[PDB]
């Protein structure tokens, strides 16, 4: 029942309820003549919402805000981007113009600026060292170490046992490396083990792209990363 890359035209966004007050958002983009899905998260925060990641571009992100107001009807007051790539920050300008306070680590803000990408306004402190965690409203933010990117964060929703791995975690159907231009392949397995150690009770694990599953997605990602390392 999770929407697949094939059922979502580029420009539209779907919401999927994972648990009480926790949704993923799913959008698509075309690259090199193929179509790719991308996930983010929405977490209820009293009578407001916390958004995790944009919907991969300005147009998709405007559609995301429209779909949230239609389906949920609570204001998105804050957004966190989990690393500096466009599937995470592309759409930050749309969020900002809509009155959403945008956040990322100082590492992410720096890398976004270097890349010429959109830059979240606010800096998240306390996430500079591997293993660092901070509470941000209804979620915990965790910096596991370098993996898919040097700045990648993961997000845990303790009330729902939902772990949002972002692009540091691959879906099961992905058996080859994705975009690894900015990755730390040498550290990625160690960073994954920090995630496993910190969130062993997670019941629902969401990758940056593709289908959710359980904690098996972590060892799966390590397997794929190690195979790529040995290519």
**Under the rule (CB under 5 A), what is the footprint of Zn ion?**
85, 87, 101, 167, 208
- Cβ neighbours of 16 (radius 10 Å): 16
- Are the C-beta atoms of 168 and 152 separated by less than 8 Å? yes
Q: Which of 39, 60, 85, 152 is catalytic?
A: 85
Q: What is the dihedral of CA 157, 140, 112, 152, to 10 degrees?
A: -80
Q: Which span sits near Na ion by CB under 5 A: 125-133, 162-170, 177-185, 202-210?
A: 125-133
Residue nearer to Zn ion on the CB measure, 21 or 61: 61
53 binds, among Zn ion, Na ion, none (CB under 5 to 8 A by kind): none
138 is in an annotated binding site: yes
25 is in an annotated binding site: no
Beta-carbon contacts of 128 under 8 Å, excluding residues fewer than 6 positions away, are: 105, 106, 107, 143
Under rule CB under 5 A, residue 133 binds Na ion: yes
What is the C-alpha separation between 140 and 122, in angstroms, rounded? 17
83 is catalytic: yes
The CB-side HSE value for 188 (13 A sphere, CA atoms) comes to 27
Please state the φ and ψ torsions of residue 63, each to the nearest 5 degrees.
-65, -40
State the residue number with the nearest CB to Na ion.
133
- Interface residues with Na ion (CB under 5 A)? 133, 140
Q: Which residue positions form the known binding site for Zn(2+)? A: 47, 83, 85, 87, 122, 148, 167, 209, 220
Which residues are designated catalytic? 83, 85, 87, 148, 179
């Amino acid at each position: 029942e999770y929407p697949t890359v094939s059922e979502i035209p580029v420009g539209e966004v779907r919401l999927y309820q994972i648990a009480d007050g926790v949704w993923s958002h799913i959008a698509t983009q075309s690259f090199d003549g193929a179509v790719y899905p991308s996930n983010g998260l929405i977490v209820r925060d009293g009578d407001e919402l916390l958004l995790i990641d944009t919907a991969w571009g300005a147009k998709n992100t405007a559609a995301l805000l429209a779909e949230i107001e239609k389906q949920i009807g609570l204001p998105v007051t804050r957004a966190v981007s989990t690393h500096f790539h466009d599937d995470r920050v592309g759409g930050v300008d749309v969020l900002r113009a809509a009155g959403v306070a945008t956040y990322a680590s100082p590492s992410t803000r720096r890398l976004a600026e270097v890349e010429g990408n959109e830059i979240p306004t606010h800096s998240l402190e306390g996430l500079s060292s591997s293993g660092d965690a901070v509470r941000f409203g209804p979620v915990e933010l965790f910096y596991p170490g370098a993996a898919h990117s040097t700045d990648n964060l993961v997000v845990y929703v303790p009330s729902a046992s939902v772990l949002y791995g972002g692009c540091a975690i691959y879906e099961l159907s992905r058996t080859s490396a994705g975009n690894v231009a900015d990755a730390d392949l040498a550290e990625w397995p160690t960073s994954i083990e920090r995630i496993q150690q910190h969130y062993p009770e997670a019941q629902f694990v969401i990758p940056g792209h593709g289908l959710p599953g359980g904690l098996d997605l972590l060892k799966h990602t390590t397997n794929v990363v190690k195979a790529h390392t040995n290519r």
